[PDB]
């Protein structure tokens, strides 16, 4: 571990990892606004016009479609000099569950 007394090792390692959970995480949900929900960020319900355009959503849906139609999944391949049926072992148990 990082430290002795395990509860301190968790919580102190959490402190150093707080960089991601504060500032970066705040900016990360703002991507998901412009993509999924509404174009404006921190908008209000108004009686006046609020626009949208978004060339971004057709681009995102196009890029997402490429990686889905070409999925990358477990396949396995033998080790260095190993037998050819080696891969089929671990794939046998993979495809069942």
């Amino acid at each position: 571990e990082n430290r002795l007394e395990s509860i301190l090792s968790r919580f102190d390692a959490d402190w150093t990892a707080s960089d991601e959970a504060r500032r970066e995480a705040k900016n990360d949900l703002f991507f998901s606004r412009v993509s999924q929900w509404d174009d404006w960020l921190s908008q209000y319900t108004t009686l006046q016009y609020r626009g949208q355009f978004d060339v971004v959503r057709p681009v995102v849906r196009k890029l997402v479609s490429e990686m889905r139609q070409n999925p990358i999944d477990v396949l396995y391949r033998p080790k260095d000099g190993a037998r050819p049926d080696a891969a089929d072992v671990l794939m046998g148990m993979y495809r069942t569950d």
Partner: protein, 146 residues
């Protein structure tokens, strides 16, 4: 000292000069001190407009000669030119070309700092995002301040 005159009576005799003063004094000079109240309540009305720092009298017993004028030193060179233009038709005469020229020039230089201070744009009215070139998009659609 003497950048601002001690009393409104000293300012009055300066207008009497500009009027005739052939060893005469108009009878509209008595209403010239009253006209200071009217001039400043027409423009500089309600304590706003062209800043002069003028203070108004009770307008009962004082005719603005029983209480302080309250004029600034800078405000002297404006007022007694515009005062001389106003009491001239009241006395059934009309001001000369030098008096009306300086009257407009002193009115303008009195208002110059006021116009400059009121010449500052509003802080982002209606809408304004902070962009992603500045971290934390946060609140947007700023009405003024947010």
């Amino acid at each position: 000292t003497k950048g601002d005159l001690v009393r409104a009576a000293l300012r009055k005799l300066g207008v009497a000069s500009d009027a005739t003063l052939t060893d005469v004094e108009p009878q509209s000079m008595q209403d010239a001190v009253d006209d200071l109240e009217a001039m400043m309540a027409e423009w500089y009305q309600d304590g706003k407009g062209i800043i002069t720092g003028y203070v108004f009298s009770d307008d009962e017993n004082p005719p603005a000669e029983g209480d302080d004028h309250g004029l600034r030193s800078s405000a002297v060179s404006a007022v007694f030119h515009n005062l001389a233009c106003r009491i001239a038709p009241d006395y059934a005469l009309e001001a000369t070309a030098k008096i009306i020229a300086t009257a407009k020039y002193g009115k303008e230089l009195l208002y110059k700092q006021t116009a400059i201070s009121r010449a500052k744009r509003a802080p982002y009215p209606s809408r304004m995002p902070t962009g992603s070139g500045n971290s934390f998009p946060n609140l947007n659609e700023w009405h003024y301040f947010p």
